[PDB]
Amino acid sequence: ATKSVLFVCLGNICRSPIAEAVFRKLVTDQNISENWRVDSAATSGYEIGNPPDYRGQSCMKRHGIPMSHVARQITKEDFATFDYILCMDESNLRDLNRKSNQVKTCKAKIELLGSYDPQKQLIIEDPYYGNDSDFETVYQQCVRCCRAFLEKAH
Numbered sequence: 730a731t732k733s734v735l736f737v738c739l740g741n742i743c744r745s746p747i748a749e750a751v752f753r754k755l756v757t758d759q760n761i762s763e764n765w766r767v768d769s770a771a772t773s774g775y776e777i778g779n780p781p782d783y784r785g786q787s788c789m790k791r792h793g794i795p796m797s798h799v800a801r802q803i804t805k806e807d808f809a810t811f812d813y814i815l816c817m818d819e820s821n822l823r824d825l826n827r828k829s830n831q832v833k834t835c836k837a838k839i840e841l842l843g844s845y846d847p848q849k850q851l852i853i854e855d856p857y858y859g860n861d862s863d864f865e866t867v868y869q870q871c872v873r874c875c876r877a878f879l880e881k882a883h
């Protein structure tokens with residue numbers, strides 16, 4: 730409602746829907762989900778319409794955080810409506826900045842989600858060709874960064 734955040738990755742089937750679900754849980758547990766619009770989107774069109782990769786679901790189920798999303802690509806409107814667009818890596822950041830320069834209204838602050846990590850792990854690497862441990866690392870990064878971002882936005 731008041732505040733809004735859009736998490737962004739390459740496909741919007743793993744890193745960003747995980748961040749979105751982690752963040753939504755955090756605000757729900759703190760009684761303030763009503764004050765937040767939370768969403769996720771992709772820089773690419775590779776996965777439009779698809780659900781989160783089941784490898785990410787396996788990880789999320791272990792941690793007891795339900796995750797549901799239909800992959801969608803970032804749009805021009807997103808720059809106008811979101812307070813924060815938080816992405817995973819330097820390619821995402823570059824692509825988002827490119828798209829932001831094509832619109833009249835950019836309300837969004839566009840940043841690396843990892844810039845909020847107290848442990849300074851700046852990049853949330855694509856685990857597509859990784860193993861279970863890589864998905865777990867992404868999850869842990871999302872938890873740390875989402876907590877810090879909620880605490881105090883840049």
Ligand SMILES: O=C(Nc1nc2ccccc2s1)[C@H](c1ccccc1)S(=O)(=O)O
Pocket residue numbers: 738739740741742743744745775776782784855856857858
């Ligand atoms: O979409 C993803 N990676 C992609 N890798 C390729 C490689 C070749 C062609 C298209 C793509 S999209 C990532 C991801 C997706 C699923 C599982 C883990 C990570 S995501 O960005 O975290 O969703």
